[PDB]
Design a protein around this ligand. Structure first.
Ligand SMILES: Nc1nc2c(ncn2[C@@H]2O[C@H](COP(=O)(O)OP(=O)(O)OP(=O)(O)O)[C@@H](O)[C@H]2O)c(=O)[nH]1
Ligand SMILES: Nc1nc2c(ncn2[C@@H]2O[C@H](COP(=O)(O)OP(=O)(O)O)[C@@H](O)[C@H]2O)c(=O)[nH]1
Ligand SMILES: [Mg+2]
Ligand SMILES: [Zn+2]
Lengths: 429, 435, 332
């Protein structure tokens, strides 16, 4: 019950999804062929939430892989853990978004969004009681941004009651992997703050920093970053895919973390993060995890929390632990950082506890902080957008697909309004 | 022939019930499959019996998320419960009162009431209701409010006892606890005969200090609350030198229609290694019960006055010692009842000692005492919740979920007015009389 | 006031209003009527009528209308929450936290009434027209004066009727309500004794006038029909057929007490006066030798006694009750 549908847009979304399904299959003991070879019945007691039991006793992920260029699709298809996706799912086009948002939302996307929605509808009717949607996409790449926003708008039209999750890879502050990424970011954020329940902001910069310093890895390949994001997502969903002394569901997180309709952008975090050698020289206790999760050097979003306040915080543990210990740790961490939390939300730590470790550890933890610091991020992007709009640079590519300037004017105004709201609530009293 | 059904709402209720029914099945020598290889009948009051040697509990486990109920169905206590009772929803209230009282629970409330009616009509001397429900969870608050209103509509005058989990002052697992608490209190204030305040923080404290376990799981808190419940019902379920029925509870501990929130307390709670080195006098355990560090609600009794107390003893107890100990307690000044209630005790004695659950944490004792005390200190606790509510309402935080789920802001304002009125009543009663 | 609050006050009010103030209320009461108390207060005094009018005119000269006086000096109308907050702060300040039950009501003919419900003290506060800067004063009146005097009095040999006779006590009033009224306006910036003065005035006229006439007469000082209705009923408590002249003169006690206490303030020991209980200012020397003063409570606002006396001077000045005028009024 409470089945979840997985959508993967853009190249980053698809790669993250490949690693994510690898992780999930490892969790439930699923062979690459798609048949169960596990050992613990609890794996199958909720196997339906992400998988569908196809006949002859096989399992197929409830995935809907979307793209506009067959390259990465074929890469996924050929590689291992690709032979179990249901082959009818791989929707792809030929033109390619060309790293443009106008193509990804108006011209090219309008031709595949119908087939995507049809497969979505088939999967929805297949499920018993739909729980919600999780969309894995970028914010820079044209396909990800444009087509994901279009799909979100259409789905919200057809399912205004379900819950919506997005794992959007926000552009990094220092580097810029693309050139027009401010435009894509602004338009995508406009659509998201329109029609999304929660948005898990991530930067590649923070993941680089974590893989470098904390994990002591000088050679971070994209496999590792995607592995980290996959572990975060698995930690988010294990609260319902598994029994727990204090269980959680996606709707619980949405209610707890989203005080106002618009302010629903979360920065995630994971713990423990130990190098290969520096592991046996540290104790794995709940206080250690809790103290690890609260610092700028372990936030997967490149913005110091100290510059603002945590509006709300959710914390999902795993593995066998003692509830009193967790409560004591949360009390201490809420006490000593009193200036780091908003005054008018007393007891602002949502807690959930699972019963199964992330496979290969004693106990783990996932942090989901809805703070005001992220305003800086938007601030940054907004400014960049403004600059690249003041000269109307690159404007012709977007204008040529039917979009016009007033779109950009409205989107920038909307983002500035959002930043104003964040600022207002940060200094509320 | 004095039956009493149990209704467990929400995850907290279901786990507490797991503990409670484990305890019962241990007490009456009942195997997990309902078979059984001073006693009377005794078990008839809680266990109904079928043709074979198989007994089944009179419990109705209702939830909106099938996870915990599925754990129950898969646990060692699978054969026990009547499978029709284990009512499971589809999508839990997700810590939202409106979902748990207007949208979702509205679609299985009828099935729950139907099973309740079947179980009631199969009984003859029905005493009353035991609702095991938390206070912060959405299902708990909303569904319990709905169910209490429905039962009060159906069963006009019968006992209705709740075991709420009062939200702690400093440890809060939820984020919207004030909203659920205020709403469920405004609703249940007109229907619940007698609630039973218990908190997790105080039980953590007790487990750390007295039992000397530094890392307790919810299993331990559940075992303690189950022991409290068993001490409450031992009068019905056993032969005692001075028995007491739940109607006596509601008559004694409830001076006014609204002020019916007594907090629990249990003694002795000592580890197995510290079982010796003390003879456990009944006067000693009475003093332990009145010790402000042993209460199971984080409220100092010294800041208020005990409007009423009810001490239920069990084991090798002799009434003269109880009389002497209570006289001594009345002599001391730090325990100051209200002037207008000169008789502040109900005493009950049972012959059956408490039984220790194997694999447990406590030690085999010969005497035990559970105190249910209605005081005025609890009033301050409401203030705290009120305060929290005010802040979280001053910014209209989280309001959109409740608004869009079948509720209005005027309802929030009305519930705030009601809580203010209750606090006013507590303050007014706390004062002394003239002339 | 419960006994003399007409049982049909609402039905007669609607009648009065709906007739455009021409109807004479025909009140009825819970039987039997307290005949003795009615007869005791059946005659109005005019001793201080010019002081009353002096205070009323002083207000209207400075503020134009009562309506503006009320809003400008009184502060905002209070919510229930705000009332409780101010009360709680007061009780703690006075050291009598947890002693008195507080109740909120709409059906009080005054701001508040201190009672003995269930043989226990009860403060009933009128939520209708409760105001920020005024409410603190009410608490100084009922709790700071009536309640503290009451508790102190219970400890004295004259704690009951017999004790009063035996020790030869003058009545508690007008000293009681005089002290309470002065205390209500104690720390205010514009401490005009409007309520006292208008009550005194209304009773004086009530003795001569029908209800209709009395209601019309008051228009000159206060416009609000609801406010006027209150003052008229208070002045005619116990009157059945209000078409005839007649009054309940009890509420004249406030101004009567004020004038007397202010006149003799220099020779009165205010802490001692409160400590001795429900006693006249004139009985202080008589009763001082026989008072038990170990654990008697003096209000918080009397601790800085120098300041307390300054406030009394400020109250006189404000209300046009200068020394010379009090001297001529009472050449004692
Ligand atoms: N004493 C005790 N309390 C528990 C236990 N498990 C959960 N709780 C309480 O449950 C509260 C969480 O809200 P719940 O009432 O459980 O919510 P729910 O029952 O899952 O129903 P929903 O709100 O719809 O999810 C916490 O505040 C805990 O205090 C337990 O094992 N023992
Ligand atoms: N975390 C992560 N991000 C990626 C990965 N590959 C690409 N990205 C991000 O995805 C963005 C490119 O979007 P992409 O899907 O390739 O372009 P599109 O075809 O127009 O949607 C860049 O900003 C990258 O930062 C990856 O393996 N991991
Ligand atoms: Mg639940
Ligand atoms: Zn008075």
């Amino acid at each position: 019950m409470r089945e979840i549908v997985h959508i993967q847009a853009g190249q980053c979304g698809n790669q993250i999804g490949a690693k994510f399904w690898e992780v999930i299959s490892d969790e439930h003991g699923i062979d690459p062929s798609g048949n169960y070879v596990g050992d613990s019945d609890l794996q199958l007691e909720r196997i339906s939430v992400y998988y569908n039991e196809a006949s002859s006793h096989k399992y197929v992920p409830r995935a809907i892989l979307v793209d506009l260029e067959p390259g990465t699709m074929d890469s996924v298809r050929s590689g291992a853990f690709g032979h179990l996706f249901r082959p009818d799912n791989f929707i792809f086009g030929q033109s390619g978004a060309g790293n443009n948002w106008a193509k990804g939302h108006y011209t090219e996307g309008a031709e595949l969004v119908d087939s995507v929605l049809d497969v979505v509808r088939k999967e929805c009717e297949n499920c018993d009681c739909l729980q919600g949607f999780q969309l894995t996409h970028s914010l820079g790449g044209g396909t990800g941004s444009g087509m994901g926003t279009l799909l979100i708008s259409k789905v919200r039209e057809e399912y205004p009651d379900r819950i919506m999750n997005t794992f959007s890879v926000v552009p990094s502050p220092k580097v810029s992997d693309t050139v027009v990424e401010p435009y894509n970011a602004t338009l995508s954020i406009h659509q998201l703050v329109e029609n999304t329940d929660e948005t898990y902001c991530i930067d590649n910069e923070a993941l680089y920093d974590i893989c470098f310093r904390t994990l002591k890895l000088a050679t971070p390949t994209y496999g590792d970053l995607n592995h980290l994001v996959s572990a975060t997502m698995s930690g988010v969903t294990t609260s319902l895919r598994f029994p727990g002394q204090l269980n959680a569901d996606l709707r619980k997180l949405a209610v707890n973390m989203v005080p106002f309709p618009r302010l629903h952008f979360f920065m995630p975090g994971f713990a423990p993060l130990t190098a290969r050698g520096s592991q046996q020289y540290r104790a794995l206790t709940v206080p250690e995890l809790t103290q690890q999760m609260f610092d700028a050097k372990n936030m997967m979003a490149a913005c110091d929390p100290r510059h603002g306040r945590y509006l709300t915080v959710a914390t999902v543990f795993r593995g066998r632990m003692s509830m009193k210990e967790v409560d004591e740790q949360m009390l201490a961490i809420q006490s000593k950082n009193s200036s780091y939390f908003v005054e008018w939300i007393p007891n602002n730590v949502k807690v959930a506890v699972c019963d199964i470790p992330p496979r290969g550890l004693k106990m783990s933890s996932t942090f989901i902080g809805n703070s005001t610091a992220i305003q800086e991020l938007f601030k940054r992007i907004s400014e960049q957008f403004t600059a690249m709009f003041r000269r109307k640079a690159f404007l012709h590519w977007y204008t040529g697909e039917g979009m016009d300037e007033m779109e950009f004017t409205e989107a920038e105004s909307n983002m500035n309004d959002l930043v104003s709201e964040y600022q207002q609530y940060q200094d509320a009293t | 022939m004095r039956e009493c059904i149990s209704i467990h709402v929400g995850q907290a209720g279901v786990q507490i019930g797991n503990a409670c029914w484990e305890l019962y099945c241990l007490e009456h020598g009942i195997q997990p499959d309902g078979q059984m290889p001073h006693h009377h009948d005794s078990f008839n009051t809680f266990f109904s019996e079928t043709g074979a040697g198989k007994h089944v509990p009179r419990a109705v486990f209702v939830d909106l998320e099938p996870t915990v109920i599925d754990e129950v169905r898969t646990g060692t206590y699978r054969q026990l419960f009547h499978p029709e009772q284990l009512i499971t929803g589809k999508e839990d209230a997700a810590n939202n009162y409106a979902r748990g009282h207007y949208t979702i629970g509205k679609e299985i409330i009828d099935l729950v009431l139907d099973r309740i009616r079947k179980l009631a009509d199969q009984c003859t001397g029905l005493q009353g209701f035991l609702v095991f429900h938390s206070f912060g969870g959405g299902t708990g608050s909303g569904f319990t409010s709905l169910l209490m209103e429905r039962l009060s509509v159906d069963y006009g005058k019968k006992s209705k006892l709740e075991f709420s989990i009062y939200p702690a002052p400093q440890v809060s697992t939820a984020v919207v606890e004030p909203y659920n608490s205020i709403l469920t209190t405004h609703t249940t204030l007109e229907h619940s005969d007698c609630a039973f305040m218990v908190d997790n923080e105080a039980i953590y404290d007790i487990c750390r200090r007295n039992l000397d376990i530094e890392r307790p799981t919810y299993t331990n808190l559940n075992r303690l609350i189950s022991q409290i419940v068993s001490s409450i019902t031992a009068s019905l379920r056993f032969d005692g030198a001075l028995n007491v029925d739940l109607t006596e509870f509601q008559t004694n501990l409830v001076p006014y229609p609204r002020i019916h929130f007594p907090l629990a307390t249990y003694a002795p709670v000592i580890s197995a290694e510290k079982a010796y080195h003390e003879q456990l006098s009944v006067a000693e355990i009475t003093n332990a019960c009145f010790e402000p560090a042993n209460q199971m609600v984080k409220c100092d009794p010294r800041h208020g006055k005990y409007m009423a107390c009810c001490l239920l003893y069990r084991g090798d107890v002799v009434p003269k010692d109880v009389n002497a100990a209570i006289a001594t307690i009345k002599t001391k000044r730090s325990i100051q009842f209200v002037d207008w209630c000169p008789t502040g005790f109900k005493v009950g004695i049972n012959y059956q000692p408490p039984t220790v659950v194997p694999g447990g944490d406590l030690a085999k004792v010969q005497r035990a005492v559970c105190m249910l005390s209605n005081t005025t200190a609890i009033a301050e606790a409401w203030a705290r919740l009120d305060h929290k509510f005010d802040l979280m309402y001053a910014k209209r935080a989280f309001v959109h979920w409740y608004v869009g789920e079948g509720m209005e802001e005027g309802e929030f304002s009305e519930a705030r007015e009601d809580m203010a009125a209750l606090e006013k009543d507590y303050e007014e009663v706390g004062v002394d009389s003239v002339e | 006031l419960v006994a003399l609050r007409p049982t049909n006050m609402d039905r007669e009010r609607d009648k009065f209003f709906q007739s455009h103030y021409t109807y004479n209320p025909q009140f009825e009461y819970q039987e039997p009527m307290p005949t003795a108390v009615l007869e005791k207060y059946c005659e109005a005094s005019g001793q201080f009528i010019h002081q009353a009018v002096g205070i009323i005119e002083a207000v209207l000269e400075k503020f134009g209308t009562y309506e503006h006086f009320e809003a400008a000096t009184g502060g905002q109308l209070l919510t229930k929450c705000q009332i409780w907050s101010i009360v709680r702060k007061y009780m703690q300040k006075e050291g009598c936290a947890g002693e008195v039950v507080v109740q909120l009501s709409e059906d009080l003919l005054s701001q508040a009434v201190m009672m003995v419900e269930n043989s226990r003290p009860t403060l009933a506060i009128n939520l209708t027209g409760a105001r920020q800067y005024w409410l603190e004063g009410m608490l100084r009146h009922q709790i700071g004066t009536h309640y503290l005097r009451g508790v102190n009095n219970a400890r004295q040999p004259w704690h009951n009727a017999e004790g009063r006779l035996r020790y030869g006590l003058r009545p508690a009033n007008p000293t009681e309500e005089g002290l309470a009224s002065l205390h209500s306006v104690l720390f205010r910036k514009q401490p005009f004794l409007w309520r006292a003065a208008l009550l005194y005035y209304t009773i004086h006229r009530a003795a001569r006038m029908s209800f209709r006439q009395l209601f019309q007469d008051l228009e000159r000082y206060v416009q609000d029909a609801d406010v006027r209705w209150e003052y008229c009923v208070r002045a005619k408590r116990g009157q059945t057929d209000t078409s005839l002249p007649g009054c309940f003169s009890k509420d004249q006690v406030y101004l009567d007490g004020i004038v007397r206490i202010l006149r003799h303030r220099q020779t009165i020991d205010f802490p001692l006066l409160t400590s001795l209980g429900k006693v006249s200012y004139e009985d202080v020397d008589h009763l001082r030798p026989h008072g038990v003063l170990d654990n008697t409570r003096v209000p918080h606002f009397m601790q800085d006694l120098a300041r307390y006396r300054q406030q009394l001077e400020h109250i006189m000045a404000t209300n046009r009750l200068d020394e010379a005028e009090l001297g001529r009024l009472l050449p004692d």
